[PDB]
Design a protein around this nucleic acid. Sequence first.
RNA 1: AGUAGUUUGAACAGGUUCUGAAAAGAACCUGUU
Lengths: 880, 443
Amino acid sequence: GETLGEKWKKRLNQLSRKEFDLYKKSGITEVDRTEAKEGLKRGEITHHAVSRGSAKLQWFVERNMVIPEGRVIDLGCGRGGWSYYCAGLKKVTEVRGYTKGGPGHEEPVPMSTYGWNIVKLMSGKDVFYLPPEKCDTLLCDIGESSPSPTVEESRTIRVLKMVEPWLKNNQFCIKVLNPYMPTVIEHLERLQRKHGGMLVRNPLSRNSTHEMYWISNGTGNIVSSVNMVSRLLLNRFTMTYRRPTIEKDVDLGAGTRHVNAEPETPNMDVIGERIRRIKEEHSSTWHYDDENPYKTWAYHGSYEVKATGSASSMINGVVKLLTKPWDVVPTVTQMAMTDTTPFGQQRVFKEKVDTRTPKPMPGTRKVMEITAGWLWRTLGRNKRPRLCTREEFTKKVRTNAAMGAVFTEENQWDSARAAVEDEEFWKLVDRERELHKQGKCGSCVYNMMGKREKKLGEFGKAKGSRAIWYMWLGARYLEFEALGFLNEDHWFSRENSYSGVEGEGLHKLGYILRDISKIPGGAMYADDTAGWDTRITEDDLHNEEKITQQMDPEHRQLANAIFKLTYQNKVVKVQRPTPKGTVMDIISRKDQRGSGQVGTYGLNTFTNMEAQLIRQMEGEGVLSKTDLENPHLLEKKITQWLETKGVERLKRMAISGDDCVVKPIDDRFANALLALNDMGKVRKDIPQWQPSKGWHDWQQVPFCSHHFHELIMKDGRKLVVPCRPQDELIGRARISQGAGWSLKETACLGKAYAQMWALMYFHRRDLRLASNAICSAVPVHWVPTSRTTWSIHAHHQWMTTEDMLTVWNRVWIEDNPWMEDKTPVTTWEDVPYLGKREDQWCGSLIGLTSRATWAQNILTAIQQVRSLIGNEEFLDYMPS
Amino acid sequence: PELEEEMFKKRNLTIMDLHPGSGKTRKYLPAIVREAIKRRLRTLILAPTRVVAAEMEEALKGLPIRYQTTATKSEHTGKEIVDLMCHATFTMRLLSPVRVPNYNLIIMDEAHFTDPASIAARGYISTRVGMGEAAAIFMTATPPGTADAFPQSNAPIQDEERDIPERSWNSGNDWITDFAGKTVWFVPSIKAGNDIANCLRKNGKKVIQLSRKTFDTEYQKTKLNDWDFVVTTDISEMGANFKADRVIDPRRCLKPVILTDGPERVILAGPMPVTVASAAQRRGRVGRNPQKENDQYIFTGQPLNNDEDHAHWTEAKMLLDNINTPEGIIPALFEPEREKSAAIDGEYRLKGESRKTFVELMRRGDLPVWLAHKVASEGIKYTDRKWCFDGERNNQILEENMDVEIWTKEGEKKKLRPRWLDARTYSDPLALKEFKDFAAGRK
RNA sequence: AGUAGUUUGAACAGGUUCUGAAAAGAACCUGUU
Ligand SMILES: Nc1ncnc2c1ncn2[C@@H]1O[C@H](CSCC[C@H](N)C(=O)O)[C@@H](O)[C@H]1O
Ligand SMILES: Nc1ccn([C@@H]2O[C@H](COP(=O)(O)OP(=O)(O)O)[C@@H](O)[C@H]2O)c(=O)n1
Ligand SMILES: Nc1ccn([C@@H]2O[C@H](COP(=O)(O)OP(=O)(O)O)[C@@H](O)[C@H]2O)c(=O)n1
Ligand SMILES: [Mn+2]
Ligand SMILES: [Mn+2]
Ligand SMILES: [Mn+2]
Ligand SMILES: [Zn+2]
Ligand SMILES: [Zn+2]
């Protein structure tokens, strides 16, 4: 039969030039290209898209229909709009485009838009003969229109047969020029049955073409979508002309990107023994998998395991029934637990962990070496490195700490307490230490898991946030013995490091920030590195190792063994889901931070201290672009700057891991991104070369997920208090580990959340009201013993308002060094609130009708929860 | 009530086109649900309004059904595979970020219903059926393409074109009160119904008022035999079993209409004839007893099938293009609804953040679909309320022939002057109050 | 106008409970990097 598309084509073929020119743009969407075209004529090579295809691809990318990632292959790249647009996406590490070129065809145009250094466009290539390659994203935009539908059908079938071998469980966006002929439809249905995806019409396409796009992230009925497009195009013939919807063109930015995908080369003289032992252990099911996804890691083998991790959340009934106005707030109701199943772990690995960062230039490496040496000498001015003993480890280790056993001889203890109590555990530790003394490692392997925390998501799940690495308990003891003095001697406390905040406590951090705000200088900057532990190069690993020059020979041998055999040569076990089940892959990597090591916090703080010192250097003019490119950079200038003012510059910073607050002497620090981006510390949520934003009020500076407000009490005393968006707190309090609904067996957890709100976030009106309501709706004689169990102390009320006020007075008055006066507060009415405007800006719902109704009729909800729990003893917390 | 097996297999969409009173709600639906329970199929049932859901619940006694509608009670255990809800509830859950079950069978009563969410749900259901992942039964007596305003009934009906009054009447109109049996009067608004029922109670006739505001109490009272008049809006024009004797249908209503005419806006176009489907459904509420042949239908004009410029086609496309599921389905319209120019011509898919703002504006702000889409497609966040004051001076909201002026939540006095005009935000006093609350930041 | 509803790492901080004459030990919970 005659399809609607064929009728549309017949109609289109018989339009005069005037009516065709009106029809082709009737009601379509269209980008404004005048300024971009004028710039492209004048040779401008930044900020401009080279064609209209960048907007077309952006339409699919912003609707999540295609998610370019990894290696991107652009078949028929033309001038390169799609490739140059994909260059700026953060998940893309390499773009390769193949266009035929020659007379009658577009040739690639060179540009310096954002990420241009990872783009390679090759002309003179006919993709119909180019052999398929492995790609993570494939973009095909090949096909030219002819007035004859049969010619277009043949061309479309040829393209569809060409692109098929390239597709293997990856992202794609493929132009189907003529999707309405029946044979093209049957081919497309078979292709979708094999590979997935969906046919989608782009509103930016003109009416003079029937082209559709086969995308990877979609489902639906192909015949129905083709029919819908045919009816749309046929209806466009007769309705009244409409001016096309102008929308502004995509800005592609400028500057290079600091990405690299070179493969890993294993040592096999350091890590060969561990891999041999692992292979010998699981010899029954040891195999080598060719479908492994590891690009920048070395892959050694796999073996079948039973999957661990979960992706479920439990609803906290008491908190949810007493926070009804937040049932409609997406930031509250979309909170879930992160996905720590092998699928989620593999996605986190593919995004963050399985990346590489380029080497710094020689000048950057020299500056880093000098700064690290000076910083290590400064940190150990009053302290000497020392060995930590088995007594301290036994005294410190948690009873339920993970054994993390990898080999069979390590798997005969149920708890860490039993292991450190046993005498065979220390014999295993002694043999591995004797191996370490000879410069060899045989049993230090990293188990990898996902962090289980609360995060915004959708459909009941959240994206995995990070990877946690940890060795066996004996290996953890060995690294504690070698490097645990950094934590036990408080090397990164504020007193010793001048910029660390180790051992301070969240509620006391704002005072520190206030103390930083009184130092003369520019604004206050707070930048977070995107995936900090994955940006750790081998250069700053050696710079962290440099601490071993202050140790004694035996301690130096042990610390060198830990640094070189386990921190700079890491063998990891990571789970992966396969069609046959779940496998454990043995992979290897040399440069990264294994978050979960004993020196994670301290070495993170050290590396960030030196990175921010170098950024202050660059902002003050001591470092220039030519100094950073110099293989023979002079050390005298850097050493002079350090010995003259390094401690004063350290006093301007507050460092906690990759969180930093810096108040430099001027605002050139905002634009000093050369060294910072060259060291690999690429900031998050911002283009790599955009200047950073500085705060002029210290009360808005984010630090450790909080900002800090200065409250004034009735008696005139000041108080710096932590605060965050209220939706985060309410959403986090409403979910827990587990699955399903839960009312009676999570009431004490809700009461604990209420106590935490009363202590840290007493200044938020909604939070204090909700905490009092939750406390009034929880039986007063229950005392929790776990997250779900409780005991009944019938003789004692657990935490009354008087007990909470006593705790508040202890925390904020008695134990607060920053309040000289020490008069205790007698009533909750003297405990202050944020200003109403400040409360509203930080996410409060005060001033809303639903909040007013909830506050007025709160006793009804409290009684409802009371009746739901049962007939228990209850106490009223609500102020009179 | 024999059921063909072919309606229970995937890729099959069954249209059931029986005339009103044939037994679709009370005979065929219980049998289909029983057979779906027997075959262990995850089943969804979709009622247009709450009176239809009440009729289903009455006709589904003794079956395990997990009702998800406010009208009915709730005693679900957890072993139910059948859910019951409304068209709008299903569509707004499809637009929400909470996952909905993969139903193996979907039954939709009154599949002609032209609420934008009903059309979006029909499109989604037909798309899922076309993928071979579900089977559907669409139950409707007046399907698309209906031109018969007088369909077949159980018993003959006397159709008379008298002149129905609009407001209360001091005298005359003896034909109204002289009737002996029960009468169902359809009114276009709750206020007109209030006036009419006051006039009717003035004449010693006790009257029940049905509306969405009084349904919860008044519907069960209607299920008695005491009453003599039911003055109602179109909440009960579909599927309502009243056991009445006369229907009074003025066949007039207000419809949202999108006007381009320079700046695009939405107006509540003045009193127009209802569509043929609406008139036929209203007439079908009487003449359902094969034992009563004296049933009367009194109307005051002719219906119109000119249903082309109405805003619900555009709004249905806006809802359908923004359905968010874990599998990323791109749905298409139900096939008989593809012949509408305004539905087929829309490309309304929004990018992620804009889509989230769109859903937030519809669900929290209670804005109409058109206005919510217009605001979201500009990249305006939910809490940003500047667009309510940035409009041209012609878009000034008047009340009592005076400019509406509000106190924002940030302590400022501003004139209500929205950038986009939707007549449904300031038509009734309650709508104006809700929109003032939204513009003030109190919603 | 009308209609429908939100469905088992490392470092640290604080709190709680029990033991203890106090120190101190034991267990749990929340949070930060
Ligand atoms: N057989 C073939 N092999 C390789 N390239 C081809 C080809 N047939 C056509 N092409 C190229 O494919 C291009 C299609 S247009 C690509 C537009 C691009 N997305 C942009 O935004 O600039 C044409 O320039 C043509 O040169
Ligand atoms: N729960 C956590 C959080 C952070 N960290 C460390 O702190 C680093 C930075 O923390 P972060 O919260 O800013 O996350 P990223 O910047 O790494 O994405 C991480 O890379 C980890 O090394 C950790 O060890 N455990
Ligand atoms: N309690 C009731 C309700 C309806 N009925 C009758 O049953 C017939 C079919 O009812 P129905 O609700 O299934 O009608 P349709 O949904 O098919 O239009 C009608 O003639 C009703 O009048 C009845 O006899 N007793
Ligand atoms: Mn970071
Ligand atoms: Mn951080
Ligand atoms: Mn019915
Ligand atoms: Zn070792
Ligand atoms: Zn705040």
